[PDB]
Chains A and B, each alone.
Chain A
Amino acid sequence: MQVILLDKVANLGSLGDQVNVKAGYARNFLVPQGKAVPATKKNIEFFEAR
């Protein structure tokens, strides 16, 4: 879905991008291993402040 990147990711990422990703590549790789977070419109200001 709408996850935002956080790292030195390959060629879809620029340290934070709103992309259209699938659910299976979202969880177990990008959810809790690091590097992403689901964009529930509360975290879009919270981690950009970080």
Chain B
Amino acid sequence: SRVCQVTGKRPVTGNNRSHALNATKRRFLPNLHSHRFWVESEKRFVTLRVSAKGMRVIDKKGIDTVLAELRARGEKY
């Protein structure tokens, strides 16, 4: 699925409002990338399906603090 693993951001729907205001259904896809992260505590390259905002969150919190949040809600990594 196209679900961000860190921030939990999922694709939502929307409308393509034209010049004549014609409504057409579409989706809002996140800027997801499969980035390979390194951790010191486990000594392993850990790949994660993260977004562009997800990389911004994981820099401030830390690579090990975010994995504590995946540990609490039972996610796999």
Contact = CB atoms under 8 A, between A and B. Distances in A.
A32 B59 contact: no
Interface of B: 37-40, 59-60, 62-63
Contacts, number: 15
Contacts of A23: 59
Interface of A: 23, 26-27, 31-33, 38, 40
Of A23, A32, A38, the most chain B CB neighbours within 10 A belong to A32
A31 B59 CA distance: 9
Contacts of B39: 32
A32 B60 contact: no
A33 to B, nearest CB: 7
